[PDB]
């Protein structure tokens, strides 16, 4: 109600600005709009149907919005997280950054606790009161495009070639990711050891005993 109020009692204040900026050029997309584009020479049948174009544009923006705020409860970079779902669930991990996909980069340092770089969902997570200082960690290398798991197109190679069956369908470890992970992990360990006994704590796991209440437990 409170965020939506400006738009609600305006109607299209943001979208008004864009038209007037375009009009600042002079005389433009009123004239251009009628002339603009393609049509007339069809395919197949009537062509009654759908997408590309227009439709894609609001949808991509709207799907971006849950990634902070709605899911998040509040969480700053370098918060300690509890993964309650995912593979690595029950591990406490440190938050590196939020991706464009909306999945979170994390990494527990590999040697001490098994957690790799990995993408995990925000929705799963309990935000704990602890913060570990991620002041001088180079999280930058790891990005959204970094996390493409190769599909079973053919062989991993260039393409167009007759291939063999020894693909990894639901998995794939790039060699490059393993080399990179060691470097990023090193900085994190320094912060972790600064506060005592945090290092052992992450690996141990949290779970609720009989008689424990998840409602009362809230970190």
């Amino acid at each position: 109600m409170a965020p939506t109020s400006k738009m609600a009692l305006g109607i299209k204040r943001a979208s008004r600005s864009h038209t007037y900026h375009r009009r600042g050029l002079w005389a433009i997309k009123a004239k251009h709009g009628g002339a603009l584009p393609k049509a007339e020479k069809p395919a197949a049948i009537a062509e009654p149907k759908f997408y590309p174009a227009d439709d894609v544009k609001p949808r991509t923006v709207s799907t971006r919005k849950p990634h902070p705020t709605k899911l998040r409860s509040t969480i700053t970079p370098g918060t300690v997280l509890i993964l309650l779902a995912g593979r690595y669930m029950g591990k406490r991990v440190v938050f590196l950054k939020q991706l464009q996909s909306g999945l979170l980069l994390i990494t527990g340092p590999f040697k001490i606790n098994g957690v790799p770089i990995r993408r995990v969902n925000q929705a799963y997570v309990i935000a704990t009161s602890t913060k570990v200082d991620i002041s001088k960690v180079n999280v930058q290398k790891f990005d959204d495009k970094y996390f493409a798991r190769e599909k079973k197109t053919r062989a991993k190679k260039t393409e167009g070639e007759l291939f063999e069956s020894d693909k990894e369908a639901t998995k794939n470890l790039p060699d490059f990711k393993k080399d990179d992970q060691k470097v990023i992990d090193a900085e994190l360990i320094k912060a972790i050891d600064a506060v005592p006994d945090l290092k052992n704590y992450l690996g141990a796991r949290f779970s609720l005993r009989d008689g424990d209440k998840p409602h009362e437990m809230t970190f």
Partner: protein, 111 residues
């Protein structure tokens, strides 16, 4: 292993499927009533909405080379004063499961 940590085999807080949603006269199997262990009140069971449920069972036959099978579900909303909850499953749980324990996860966490 990977996904492995340092102890607790029991990952979840316990719960019990008492029965299905019911009159004295009839049952509706579409919604199931679960009394969740350690949950005393109406307020406390309000937390449990949205959580994932697994009924894990073993069976004589293999499937995709495993004898263990599971039916998943979700907690819909609370039911009654005693900490009973309403739940839906993807396919209904077998009603032989009356009196069985079922698992209610932390898995999607609102907190």
């Amino acid at each position: 292993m990977k996904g492995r940590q340092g102890q607790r085999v029991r990952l979840y807080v316990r719960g019990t499927i008492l029965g299905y949603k019911r009159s004295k006269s009839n049952q509706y199997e579409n919604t199931s009533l679960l009394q969740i262990e350690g949950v005393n009140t109406k307020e406390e069971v309000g937390w449990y909405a949205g959580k994932r449920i697994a009924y894990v069972y073993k069976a004589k036959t293999k499937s995709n080379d495993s004898t263990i099978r599971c039916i998943w579900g979700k907690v819909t909303r609370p039911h009654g004063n005693s900490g009973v909850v309403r739940a839906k499953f993807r396919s209904n749980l077998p009603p032989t499961s009356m009196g069985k324990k079922v698992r209610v996860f932390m898995y999607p966490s609102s907190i």
